C-alpha cells in the first residue's frame, strides 16, 4: 500500500504528536499542504512572515514539550525563517523546518528561486545553526530521513532541523512505513551511581550548598524533582535569567535569579563565597548567567555540574564532578539515594499591576529589550515553566510571535507577552494571524518611542553624543491593532493599565495594550553591567 | 603618521566609494561603528524597523545608485535578519556590503552575549553561500586591506554582496590612516577580443532575421545608451528578459517587449516562431522565467551569441557559437565602432493604466513579488532606462516594499512608486515608518486582494480548490496601518478614486500609501501560459 513521499512525512510527524505547522506556502511547497490537508489531524497556520512562523514553532515547542514544525518555500521563504531557527538552536529546543526545493530536472539551470549549491544553497546556509541540514535525495529515503530528523531534534541537547524536499520526489509513491517514536529513537542518559553517591556525600557534609538551575530544567521537564530535591535537601535554589520559572520564586528556598537583571538575594549568596558546594544543573554558564564569568562564583570545596551535553561540562569553570546526564534522571536518582540514606508610567508598577491580576497559571512571554530587565527582575514566577524568555539569541521580535504558538500549545491557560515597541515593529504583524485564528493572546507594548536600551548606552557610554535610538514619532499601536482586526487599549496611567488588563483577559480574543513609558527610565540591572 | 580607530578608517574608505547611507539597526557591539559615522559627518545612517528591510534598502539604493549599498547589523539575530536581503543582492548581482558585529575576542568559546563565532551562531559561515566573500576581521591592521578587498570583490567581475564581520574590541584599536581612491585597489572591466567582435559583426551583416535579448546585465554595466545605439545602428529588434524591463525603451519602434514570464506575444512569436537565425543575448542568465522553462525553440537557426561578464554563465543552458566574456558596455561600444567604421474590486489591468496615464516619465517603478509581477511586467510600459526595479533573481516577497525607500534616497529628485501585494506588505510593510521618520516621499500602491493571490490561483488551477491556504478572513486595512505609522493614505474602490488618490500622492512630497481593493480570483497575464 502506498503513499506519496510527502504524505508519509506528515503521517510520521503525526506520530510525534505534532499538531500545528506554521509557515507560508509556495509553488514547490504545495504538495506538503495538499498532504497536511488530506489528513486533517495536523493543521496549517498561515503567518505573515516566515520568521514569525519559526518563532511560533519554537514557542509551541518550548511549552508543548513536543516537536515544533514550520514550513517555507524555496529560497527566500527559507532564508526568512533563519533567525527563528537560530533561536531554536541557541535555546536547545526541537524545531523541524521543512523547506521545498525545485525539481532535480532544473538543478544547475537557473530554476526559479533555486536553492541548491548552484543558487541559494539552503542546506549550507542552515548547517551552522541546525543539528542536521540535508536534502532528501530520493523519495524512498523519506521515511528513514524524517525519522533521522525527529531522532536528532529530540535527542541529546535538543535543537532545530532543516529538511529540504525537492518538489518532484514529494509525490513519488513509497511504501507506508510509520513507526511510534520509541522505535527509532532512544531514551535519555542517567548519571553513574558513582557520581550520584559522591555528590550525595558532598551535600551531606556541606556548610553552604547552593543550586543554580538553568534552562535545561525546562527541556528535561525537571521541575518536580528539582522541587523535591531542594525541599529534601534544604538547599537554596537560584535560577539563570533564562532559567527563571524553573523554581517557584515565592518558595522559602528561592533566591530568585542570578546574573543579568538579577536579585541580590542570589548575588550575595552565590557571589560572596561562603558557598562551598555549587550544583549547576542545566546551564551553559554564559555571559549573563555568570555576571561576565566572575571568578567569585567558583565554590571553595566542590563545583558539581549536570548537563546532557558533554561539551558544556567544565567549559568556563573547573568542575569537581561533571555529570553527563538528563537533569530529571539525575535528580530522581539523587532523591532516591538521599531518602534511601534516611539521615509615562514607570515600568516597575506595570509589572506590579500584572502581578496583581494575571492568573496563577499565566504563561508570560517576554521579549528582548528593556522588557527583560523588568521581566526578570520584578515579575515573580511561581508556576513551573510559565516564564518564557528567549535569551539564547535574544532576538528582538521573538515573543511577539512566539507567544502565539505558546497559547496554541496551552489553550486553556492565559498567555501574555510583554514586549518593547521596536520589537513589535519587527514582528508585530503576526497579531493579524492570531486574529485570523482567534488565538486569544494579550500583548503589552512597553512603548518608549524607540530603542530603550540603545538610548541608554549612548547616554552612559558615548555621553549623549548622538541619537540612533529614538523616534521622532511614536508608533500608534492601537490604530495598528485596529488595522489588523485586534481589540486595543491605551494606558498612560497605572489604573488605565489595570482596567485594560482585566478587560483583555475577559475578552476571549486577541488584545493589545499600548503602555506609555519614559525612554530614560534606567532598568534594573542595567547600571551594573555598565 | 596620523592614527585613527579601525572603524573610522572603515567609514573613511567607504566615503571614498561614494556610499551615502548605512541602513541598519544598532546594537551593543555595533555602537562603535555608529560613533564613527556620526563623528565624521558625511555618510548618514538610516534606522530601519527590521534589518531585512535595511538590506532591502541597501540593495535598492545600490541598484538605483549605480554605487555600493551598505547596511549594518549587530551580533547574532541582527545579522541573521539581514540574510534574505543579502541573498537578494546575491541573486540579482547587486553590490551590497553588510557590516555585522562580533563580540570581543576574549569571549570566544565562552558563551558571550549573542556570540556569533564557530562556537555560537556562525555569521561568517551562514553568509558564505550567498556572498562573494564573508570573512571576520582578524586584526585591527587588516581593516584597511580587508575593507579594500571587499570593495574590489563586491564591484569587480559579476557584482555581488560582501559580509564583513568586525570584533567589537578591534573596532577601537588605533591604526594608521590608509585611505585610497577606488581605482588603486580595483581593476577596470573586461572587453571582447577584436576577433569575436568582428565575428559577431559579420554575422549580423549576413543575418536575415536577427534578434537581441537584453537582460539584467545591461543595468549593471550601465549600458543603456549603447544598446539603443547598437539596435538603432543595426536595425535589429530588442527583447528584454522580465527583469531587464527598463533597459530598452518600450516606446521605440524596435522594441519587442519582454520575452518570457508575463511577456508579450510580440517577443514570443519572433524568438520562438522559428525564423530567427542570429540571436544575441546580452546579460541574461537564461534561467527559467527568462526562457519559458528553457524552451528549445529559442535556439537560433544560424548562430547564438552570448555576452556576459561571468564566464560560467556562457552556454550553460543553450549552446553558443560565439561566447564573449566581457562587460556589456565595452562590448557594445566596440561593436558599434566596428560596424560604423565598417561603413556599410478594481481590475488591476486598469490600475496600472491609471498609473501610466498619470505618473511622470522619469518615475522609477518598484514592483514586488506576487501578481504585481504579471501586471507590472505585462501591462506597464517602461520608457526610461532603469526605471523598472523588480527583484526577480530570488523573487523575495517584500523586497520592493523596503527597497523603494533606498531607491528614492539614491534618486531624490525623481518620482518613486512601489506596486506591491497585500501579503508582501504584511512582511515588510512597517518600513514605511522609516520613510515617515526621514521624510522620504514614496508612494505605495497596495493591491489588497485579501491574501496570497497566486497561491489561491494555484489551488484552483492545480489542486481544484481542495484547500484554501490563500485568503485571509479579514483583509488588512492598510490605511489604518499607514495612519498609525504616520503616513498619509488613501483607499480606492473605484478607478477614479485611484486616479484622484495617485494624483494627490504625487503632489504631496511625503510618503503615501494607496490601498486598492482587488479581486483575488482575477487571472493575471501569463499565468495561463505557465500552467501545464
Ligand atoms: C534582531 C535584533 N536586532 C538588534 C538587537 C539589539 N538590541 C538590543 C540588545 O539586547 C542589546 C542591548 C544593546 C544591544 S536591545 C534593542 C532595542 C529594543 O528596543 P525596544 O524593542 O523598544 O525595547 P526597549 O525600548 O524597551 O529598550 C536592540 C535593537 C537585537 N537584540 N535583536
Ligand atoms: C518571502 C517569500 N515567501 C514566500 C514566497 C512564495 N510566494 C510567491 C512566489 O512567487 C511563488 C509563486 C507561488 C510561490 S507569491 C506569494 C504570495 C503573494 O501575495 P501578495 O503579496 O498579496 O501578492 P498577490 O496577491 O498578488 O498574489 C508567495 C507567498 C515568496 N515569494 N517569498
Ligand atoms: N534534558 C536536559 N538535561 C540537562 N541539561 C540539559 C538538558 N537539555 C539541555 N540541557 C542543557 O542546558 C543548558 C542550557 O543552557 P542555556 O540554553 O545557555 O541556558 P542558561 O543560559 O540558562 O544556562 C545547555 O548546556 C544544555 O546542554
Ligand atoms: N557588467 C556586466 N556586463 C554584462 N553582463 C553582466 C554584467 N554584470 C552581470 N552580468 C550578467 O548578467 C546576468 C544577470 O542575470 P540575471 O540576474 O539572471 O538577469 P536575467 O533574468 O535578466 O537574466 C548574469 O549572467 C551576469 O553574469
Ligand atoms: Mg522601546
Ligand atoms: Mg495580494
PDB file of N, CA and C in Angstrom, chain A residues 38-120:
ATOM      1  N   UNK A  38      -4.955  16.525   3.721  1.00  0.00           N
ATOM      2  CA  UNK A  38      -5.635  15.352   3.240  1.00  0.00           C
ATOM      3  C   UNK A  38      -5.926  14.654   4.492  1.00  0.00           C
ATOM      4  N   UNK A  39      -4.997  14.765   5.407  1.00  0.00           N
ATOM      5  CA  UNK A  39      -5.185  14.060   6.662  1.00  0.00           C
ATOM      6  C   UNK A  39      -6.060  14.622   7.740  1.00  0.00           C
ATOM      7  N   UNK A  40      -6.050  15.929   7.870  1.00  0.00           N
ATOM      8  CA  UNK A  40      -6.852  16.621   8.843  1.00  0.00           C
ATOM      9  C   UNK A  40      -6.684  16.166  10.253  1.00  0.00           C
ATOM     10  N   UNK A  41      -5.442  16.069  10.651  1.00  0.00           N
ATOM     11  CA  UNK A  41      -5.083  15.724  12.019  1.00  0.00           C
ATOM     12  C   UNK A  41      -4.101  16.802  12.460  1.00  0.00           C
ATOM     13  N   UNK A  42      -3.300  17.252  11.498  1.00  0.00           N
ATOM     14  CA  UNK A  42      -2.319  18.310  11.690  1.00  0.00           C
ATOM     15  C   UNK A  42      -2.954  19.516  11.044  1.00  0.00           C
ATOM     16  N   UNK A  43      -2.727  20.695  11.571  1.00  0.00           N
ATOM     17  CA  UNK A  43      -3.370  21.837  10.949  1.00  0.00           C
ATOM     18  C   UNK A  43      -2.340  22.882  10.522  1.00  0.00           C
ATOM     19  N   UNK A  44      -2.509  23.481   9.341  1.00  0.00           N
ATOM     20  CA  UNK A  44      -1.557  24.504   8.890  1.00  0.00           C
ATOM     21  C   UNK A  44      -1.950  25.897   9.361  1.00  0.00           C
ATOM     22  N   UNK A  45      -0.947  26.655   9.794  1.00  0.00           N
ATOM     23  CA  UNK A  45      -1.138  28.013  10.288  1.00  0.00           C
ATOM     24  C   UNK A  45      -0.433  28.983   9.348  1.00  0.00           C
ATOM     25  N   UNK A  46      -1.223  29.806   8.655  1.00  0.00           N
ATOM     26  CA  UNK A  46      -0.688  30.802   7.748  1.00  0.00           C
ATOM     27  C   UNK A  46      -0.272  32.028   8.531  1.00  0.00           C
ATOM     28  N   UNK A  47       1.011  32.329   8.497  1.00  0.00           N
ATOM     29  CA  UNK A  47       1.540  33.504   9.163  1.00  0.00           C
ATOM     30  C   UNK A  47       1.848  34.610   8.136  1.00  0.00           C
ATOM     31  N   UNK A  48       2.330  35.736   8.642  1.00  0.00           N
ATOM     32  CA  UNK A  48       2.593  36.895   7.815  1.00  0.00           C
ATOM     33  C   UNK A  48       4.059  37.015   7.428  1.00  0.00           C
ATOM     34  N   UNK A  49       4.930  36.232   8.062  1.00  0.00           N
ATOM     35  CA  UNK A  49       6.360  36.248   7.782  1.00  0.00           C
ATOM     36  C   UNK A  49       6.951  34.910   8.236  1.00  0.00           C
ATOM     37  N   UNK A  50       7.907  34.384   7.471  1.00  0.00           N
ATOM     38  CA  UNK A  50       8.406  33.049   7.807  1.00  0.00           C
ATOM     39  C   UNK A  50       9.218  33.031   9.105  1.00  0.00           C
ATOM     40  N   UNK A  51       9.829  34.149   9.512  1.00  0.00           N
ATOM     41  CA  UNK A  51      10.457  34.136  10.833  1.00  0.00           C
ATOM     42  C   UNK A  51       9.408  34.117  11.921  1.00  0.00           C
ATOM     43  N   UNK A  52       8.252  34.729  11.661  1.00  0.00           N
ATOM     44  CA  UNK A  52       7.162  34.630  12.610  1.00  0.00           C
ATOM     45  C   UNK A  52       6.684  33.203  12.807  1.00  0.00           C
ATOM     46  N   UNK A  53       6.559  32.437  11.722  1.00  0.00           N
ATOM     47  CA  UNK A  53       6.195  31.033  11.875  1.00  0.00           C
ATOM     48  C   UNK A  53       7.259  30.289  12.670  1.00  0.00           C
ATOM     49  N   UNK A  54       8.531  30.523  12.344  1.00  0.00           N
ATOM     50  CA  UNK A  54       9.598  29.833  13.063  1.00  0.00           C
ATOM     51  C   UNK A  54       9.559  30.200  14.537  1.00  0.00           C
ATOM     52  N   UNK A  55       9.245  31.422  14.824  1.00  0.00           N
ATOM     53  CA  UNK A  55       9.193  31.834  16.174  1.00  0.00           C
ATOM     54  C   UNK A  55       8.020  31.155  16.825  1.00  0.00           C
ATOM     55  N   UNK A  56       6.990  30.871  16.074  1.00  0.00           N
ATOM     56  CA  UNK A  56       5.851  30.254  16.670  1.00  0.00           C
ATOM     57  C   UNK A  56       6.107  28.790  16.949  1.00  0.00           C
ATOM     58  N   UNK A  57       6.660  28.087  15.992  1.00  0.00           N
ATOM     59  CA  UNK A  57       7.024  26.705  16.155  1.00  0.00           C
ATOM     60  C   UNK A  57       7.922  26.563  17.369  1.00  0.00           C
ATOM     61  N   UNK A  58       8.876  27.492  17.544  1.00  0.00           N
ATOM     62  CA  UNK A  58       9.742  27.467  18.726  1.00  0.00           C
ATOM     63  C   UNK A  58       8.924  27.643  19.996  1.00  0.00           C
ATOM     64  N   UNK A  59       8.004  28.611  19.983  1.00  0.00           N
ATOM     65  CA  UNK A  59       7.136  28.840  21.132  1.00  0.00           C
ATOM     66  C   UNK A  59       6.219  27.670  21.431  1.00  0.00           C
ATOM     67  N   UNK A  60       5.617  27.080  20.388  1.00  0.00           N
ATOM     68  CA  UNK A  60       4.831  25.869  20.587  1.00  0.00           C
ATOM     69  C   UNK A  60       5.689  24.778  21.223  1.00  0.00           C
ATOM     70  N   UNK A  61       6.915  24.612  20.731  1.00  0.00           N
ATOM     71  CA  UNK A  61       7.779  23.543  21.219  1.00  0.00           C
ATOM     72  C   UNK A  61       8.101  23.685  22.707  1.00  0.00           C
ATOM     73  N   UNK A  62       8.568  24.844  23.122  1.00  0.00           N
ATOM     74  CA  UNK A  62       9.005  25.039  24.499  1.00  0.00           C
ATOM     75  C   UNK A  62       7.969  24.870  25.540  1.00  0.00           C
ATOM     76  N   UNK A  63       6.726  25.109  25.205  1.00  0.00           N
ATOM     77  CA  UNK A  63       5.724  24.944  26.197  1.00  0.00           C
ATOM     78  C   UNK A  63       5.086  23.625  25.954  1.00  0.00           C
ATOM     79  N   UNK A  64       4.793  23.268  24.708  1.00  0.00           N
ATOM     80  CA  UNK A  64       4.260  21.942  24.443  1.00  0.00           C
ATOM     81  C   UNK A  64       5.127  20.853  25.051  1.00  0.00           C
ATOM     82  N   UNK A  65       6.440  21.043  25.072  1.00  0.00           N
ATOM     83  CA  UNK A  65       7.351  19.932  25.279  1.00  0.00           C
ATOM     84  C   UNK A  65       7.425  18.927  24.145  1.00  0.00           C
ATOM     85  N   UNK A  66       6.858  19.236  22.988  1.00  0.00           N
ATOM     86  CA  UNK A  66       6.901  18.360  21.831  1.00  0.00           C
ATOM     87  C   UNK A  66       7.736  19.025  20.737  1.00  0.00           C
ATOM     88  N   UNK A  67       7.653  18.474  19.528  1.00  0.00           N
ATOM     89  CA  UNK A  67       8.460  18.933  18.407  1.00  0.00           C
ATOM     90  C   UNK A  67       7.704  20.019  17.651  1.00  0.00           C
ATOM     91  N   UNK A  68       8.371  21.146  17.413  1.00  0.00           N
ATOM     92  CA  UNK A  68       7.800  22.216  16.606  1.00  0.00           C
ATOM     93  C   UNK A  68       8.153  22.068  15.132  1.00  0.00           C
ATOM     94  N   UNK A  69       7.193  22.417  14.276  1.00  0.00           N
ATOM     95  CA  UNK A  69       7.323  22.269  12.830  1.00  0.00           C
ATOM     96  C   UNK A  69       6.912  23.571  12.151  1.00  0.00           C
ATOM     97  N   UNK A  70       7.762  24.068  11.257  1.00  0.00           N
ATOM     98  CA  UNK A  70       7.423  25.179  10.381  1.00  0.00           C
ATOM     99  C   UNK A  70       7.774  24.812   8.942  1.00  0.00           C
ATOM    100  N   UNK A  71       7.116  25.470   8.008  1.00  0.00           N
ATOM    101  CA  UNK A  71       7.335  25.238   6.593  1.00  0.00           C
ATOM    102  C   UNK A  71       7.632  26.574   5.907  1.00  0.00           C
ATOM    103  N   UNK A  72       8.396  26.476   4.829  1.00  0.00           N
ATOM    104  CA  UNK A  72       8.721  27.613   3.979  1.00  0.00           C
ATOM    105  C   UNK A  72       9.015  27.114   2.560  1.00  0.00           C
ATOM    106  N   UNK A  73       8.871  28.018   1.584  1.00  0.00           N
ATOM    107  CA  UNK A  73       9.082  27.692   0.180  1.00  0.00           C
ATOM    108  C   UNK A  73      10.563  27.836  -0.167  1.00  0.00           C
ATOM    109  N   UNK A  74      10.871  27.631  -1.448  1.00  0.00           N
ATOM    110  CA  UNK A  74      12.245  27.714  -1.933  1.00  0.00           C
ATOM    111  C   UNK A  74      12.832  29.099  -1.672  1.00  0.00           C
ATOM    112  N   UNK A  75      14.148  29.144  -1.520  1.00  0.00           N
ATOM    113  CA  UNK A  75      14.868  30.393  -1.485  1.00  0.00           C
ATOM    114  C   UNK A  75      14.505  31.314  -0.337  1.00  0.00           C
ATOM    115  N   UNK A  76      13.863  32.440  -0.663  1.00  0.00           N
ATOM    116  CA  UNK A  76      13.645  33.480   0.353  1.00  0.00           C
ATOM    117  C   UNK A  76      12.620  33.081   1.405  1.00  0.00           C
ATOM    118  N   UNK A  77      11.674  32.208   1.064  1.00  0.00           N
ATOM    119  CA  UNK A  77      10.846  31.629   2.104  1.00  0.00           C
ATOM    120  C   UNK A  77      11.711  31.015   3.185  1.00  0.00           C
ATOM    121  N   UNK A  78      12.694  30.207   2.766  1.00  0.00           N
ATOM    122  CA  UNK A  78      13.559  29.528   3.718  1.00  0.00           C
ATOM    123  C   UNK A  78      14.469  30.511   4.441  1.00  0.00           C
ATOM    124  N   UNK A  79      15.164  31.373   3.692  1.00  0.00           N
ATOM    125  CA  UNK A  79      16.056  32.345   4.323  1.00  0.00           C
ATOM    126  C   UNK A  79      15.310  33.228   5.316  1.00  0.00           C
ATOM    127  N   UNK A  80      14.016  33.431   5.105  1.00  0.00           N
ATOM    128  CA  UNK A  80      13.273  34.265   6.038  1.00  0.00           C
ATOM    129  C   UNK A  80      13.205  33.631   7.416  1.00  0.00           C
ATOM    130  N   UNK A  81      13.041  32.313   7.467  1.00  0.00           N
ATOM    131  CA  UNK A  81      12.865  31.659   8.754  1.00  0.00           C
ATOM    132  C   UNK A  81      14.142  31.597   9.572  1.00  0.00           C
ATOM    133  N   UNK A  82      15.294  31.894   8.966  1.00  0.00           N
ATOM    134  CA  UNK A  82      16.570  31.543   9.589  1.00  0.00           C
ATOM    135  C   UNK A  82      16.685  32.072  11.013  1.00  0.00           C
ATOM    136  N   UNK A  83      16.291  33.314  11.240  1.00  0.00           N
ATOM    137  CA  UNK A  83      16.554  33.875  12.550  1.00  0.00           C
ATOM    138  C   UNK A  83      15.795  33.118  13.632  1.00  0.00           C
ATOM    139  N   UNK A  84      14.627  32.560  13.291  1.00  0.00           N
ATOM    140  CA  UNK A  84      13.887  31.757  14.247  1.00  0.00           C
ATOM    141  C   UNK A  84      14.540  30.415  14.486  1.00  0.00           C
ATOM    142  N   UNK A  85      15.080  29.816  13.422  1.00  0.00           N
ATOM    143  CA  UNK A  85      15.802  28.568  13.554  1.00  0.00           C
ATOM    144  C   UNK A  85      17.073  28.785  14.349  1.00  0.00           C
ATOM    145  N   UNK A  86      17.672  29.974  14.241  1.00  0.00           N
ATOM    146  CA  UNK A  86      18.871  30.277  15.016  1.00  0.00           C
ATOM    147  C   UNK A  86      18.549  30.463  16.494  1.00  0.00           C
ATOM    148  N   UNK A  87      17.323  30.880  16.819  1.00  0.00           N
ATOM    149  CA  UNK A  87      16.946  30.996  18.223  1.00  0.00           C
ATOM    150  C   UNK A  87      16.626  29.628  18.827  1.00  0.00           C
ATOM    151  N   UNK A  88      15.924  28.775  18.072  1.00  0.00           N
ATOM    152  CA  UNK A  88      15.722  27.395  18.496  1.00  0.00           C
ATOM    153  C   UNK A  88      17.055  26.678  18.701  1.00  0.00           C
ATOM    154  N   UNK A  89      18.074  27.052  17.917  1.00  0.00           N
ATOM    155  CA  UNK A  89      19.383  26.423  18.034  1.00  0.00           C
ATOM    156  C   UNK A  89      20.092  26.829  19.317  1.00  0.00           C
ATOM    157  N   UNK A  90      19.948  28.090  19.732  1.00  0.00           N
ATOM    158  CA  UNK A  90      20.651  28.585  20.912  1.00  0.00           C
ATOM    159  C   UNK A  90      19.903  28.313  22.205  1.00  0.00           C
ATOM    160  N   UNK A  91      18.620  27.960  22.119  1.00  0.00           N
ATOM    161  CA  UNK A  91      17.783  27.644  23.279  1.00  0.00           C
ATOM    162  C   UNK A  91      17.536  26.144  23.455  1.00  0.00           C
ATOM    163  N   UNK A  92      18.134  25.307  22.605  1.00  0.00           N
ATOM    164  CA  UNK A  92      18.076  23.851  22.735  1.00  0.00           C
ATOM    165  C   UNK A  92      16.648  23.321  22.601  1.00  0.00           C
ATOM    166  N   UNK A  93      15.904  23.877  21.646  1.00  0.00           N
ATOM    167  CA  UNK A  93      14.534  23.418  21.510  1.00  0.00           C
ATOM    168  C   UNK A  93      14.335  22.737  20.161  1.00  0.00           C
ATOM    169  N   UNK A  94      13.620  21.597  20.128  1.00  0.00           N
ATOM    170  CA  UNK A  94      13.455  20.835  18.880  1.00  0.00           C
ATOM    171  C   UNK A  94      12.458  21.425  17.899  1.00  0.00           C
ATOM    172  N   UNK A  95      12.961  22.056  16.843  1.00  0.00           N
ATOM    173  CA  UNK A  95      12.146  22.601  15.764  1.00  0.00           C
ATOM    174  C   UNK A  95      12.572  21.892  14.488  1.00  0.00           C
ATOM    175  N   UNK A  96      11.591  21.450  13.713  1.00  0.00           N
ATOM    176  CA  UNK A  96      11.799  20.885  12.388  1.00  0.00           C
ATOM    177  C   UNK A  96      11.312  21.914  11.366  1.00  0.00           C
ATOM    178  N   UNK A  97      12.229  22.401  10.509  1.00  0.00           N
ATOM    179  CA  UNK A  97      11.915  23.351   9.432  1.00  0.00           C
ATOM    180  C   UNK A  97      11.861  22.595   8.113  1.00  0.00           C
ATOM    181  N   UNK A  98      10.694  22.573   7.489  1.00  0.00           N
ATOM    182  CA  UNK A  98      10.521  21.967   6.180  1.00  0.00           C
ATOM    183  C   UNK A  98      10.625  23.047   5.109  1.00  0.00           C
ATOM    184  N   UNK A  99      11.532  22.846   4.159  1.00  0.00           N
ATOM    185  CA  UNK A  99      11.743  23.747   3.035  1.00  0.00           C
ATOM    186  C   UNK A  99      11.623  22.958   1.742  1.00  0.00           C
ATOM    187  N   UNK A 100      11.030  23.590   0.737  1.00  0.00           N
ATOM    188  CA  UNK A 100      10.896  22.991  -0.582  1.00  0.00           C
ATOM    189  C   UNK A 100      12.169  23.183  -1.396  1.00  0.00           C
ATOM    190  N   UNK A 101      12.285  22.376  -2.448  1.00  0.00           N
ATOM    191  CA  UNK A 101      13.336  22.521  -3.439  1.00  0.00           C
ATOM    192  C   UNK A 101      12.737  22.404  -4.838  1.00  0.00           C
ATOM    193  N   UNK A 102      13.395  23.051  -5.804  1.00  0.00           N
ATOM    194  CA  UNK A 102      12.993  22.859  -7.186  1.00  0.00           C
ATOM    195  C   UNK A 102      13.245  21.403  -7.581  1.00  0.00           C
ATOM    196  N   UNK A 103      12.555  20.956  -8.626  1.00  0.00           N
ATOM    197  CA  UNK A 103      12.744  19.592  -9.085  1.00  0.00           C
ATOM    198  C   UNK A 103      14.156  19.361  -9.590  1.00  0.00           C
ATOM    199  N   UNK A 104      14.645  18.131  -9.396  1.00  0.00           N
ATOM    200  CA  UNK A 104      16.027  17.820  -9.772  1.00  0.00           C
ATOM    201  C   UNK A 104      16.294  18.135 -11.246  1.00  0.00           C
ATOM    202  N   UNK A 105      15.272  18.015 -12.102  1.00  0.00           N
ATOM    203  CA  UNK A 105      15.415  18.273 -13.536  1.00  0.00           C
ATOM    204  C   UNK A 105      15.814  19.711 -13.862  1.00  0.00           C
ATOM    205  N   UNK A 106      15.789  20.614 -12.886  1.00  0.00           N
ATOM    206  CA  UNK A 106      16.154  22.006 -13.073  1.00  0.00           C
ATOM    207  C   UNK A 106      17.431  22.383 -12.337  1.00  0.00           C
ATOM    208  N   UNK A 107      18.101  21.426 -11.684  1.00  0.00           N
ATOM    209  CA  UNK A 107      19.354  21.718 -10.994  1.00  0.00           C
ATOM    210  C   UNK A 107      20.401  22.265 -11.963  1.00  0.00           C
ATOM    211  N   UNK A 108      21.080  23.331 -11.528  1.00  0.00           N
ATOM    212  CA  UNK A 108      22.101  23.988 -12.315  1.00  0.00           C
ATOM    213  C   UNK A 108      21.596  24.831 -13.465  1.00  0.00           C
ATOM    214  N   UNK A 109      20.291  24.839 -13.736  1.00  0.00           N
ATOM    215  CA  UNK A 109      19.741  25.528 -14.896  1.00  0.00           C
ATOM    216  C   UNK A 109      19.350  26.975 -14.622  1.00  0.00           C
ATOM    217  N   UNK A 110      19.288  27.393 -13.360  1.00  0.00           N
ATOM    218  CA  UNK A 110      18.761  28.707 -13.045  1.00  0.00           C
ATOM    219  C   UNK A 110      17.267  28.648 -12.811  1.00  0.00           C
ATOM    220  N   UNK A 111      16.839  27.646 -12.048  1.00  0.00           N
ATOM    221  CA  UNK A 111      15.429  27.490 -11.738  1.00  0.00           C
ATOM    222  C   UNK A 111      14.930  28.651 -10.884  1.00  0.00           C
ATOM    223  N   UNK A 112      13.614  28.814 -10.870  1.00  0.00           N
ATOM    224  CA  UNK A 112      13.022  29.900 -10.113  1.00  0.00           C
ATOM    225  C   UNK A 112      13.286  29.677  -8.633  1.00  0.00           C
ATOM    226  N   UNK A 113      13.940  30.656  -7.999  1.00  0.00           N
ATOM    227  CA  UNK A 113      14.321  30.573  -6.584  1.00  0.00           C
ATOM    228  C   UNK A 113      15.068  29.273  -6.275  1.00  0.00           C
ATOM    229  N   UNK A 114      16.013  28.914  -7.138  1.00  0.00           N
ATOM    230  CA  UNK A 114      16.787  27.689  -6.943  1.00  0.00           C
ATOM    231  C   UNK A 114      17.573  27.718  -5.626  1.00  0.00           C
ATOM    232  N   UNK A 115      17.414  26.665  -4.816  1.00  0.00           N
ATOM    233  CA  UNK A 115      18.101  26.622  -3.523  1.00  0.00           C
ATOM    234  C   UNK A 115      19.093  25.466  -3.436  1.00  0.00           C
ATOM    235  N   UNK A 116      19.883  25.264  -4.494  1.00  0.00           N
ATOM    236  CA  UNK A 116      20.946  24.270  -4.497  1.00  0.00           C
ATOM    237  C   UNK A 116      22.301  24.963  -4.352  1.00  0.00           C
ATOM    238  N   UNK A 117      23.372  24.175  -4.463  1.00  0.00           N
ATOM    239  CA  UNK A 117      24.716  24.752  -4.462  1.00  0.00           C
ATOM    240  C   UNK A 117      24.867  25.763  -5.596  1.00  0.00           C
ATOM    241  N   UNK A 118      24.107  25.595  -6.684  1.00  0.00           N
ATOM    242  CA  UNK A 118      24.190  26.481  -7.844  1.00  0.00           C
ATOM    243  C   UNK A 118      23.383  27.767  -7.694  1.00  0.00           C
ATOM    244  N   UNK A 119      22.483  27.842  -6.706  1.00  0.00           N
ATOM    245  CA  UNK A 119      21.717  29.039  -6.442  1.00  0.00           C
ATOM    246  C   UNK A 119      21.886  29.549  -5.027  1.00  0.00           C
ATOM    247  N   UNK A 120      20.791  29.578  -4.268  1.00  0.00           N
ATOM    248  CA  UNK A 120      20.816  29.941  -2.857  1.00  0.00           C
ATOM    249  C   UNK A 120      20.792  28.635  -2.062  1.00  0.00           C
TER     250      UNK A 120
END
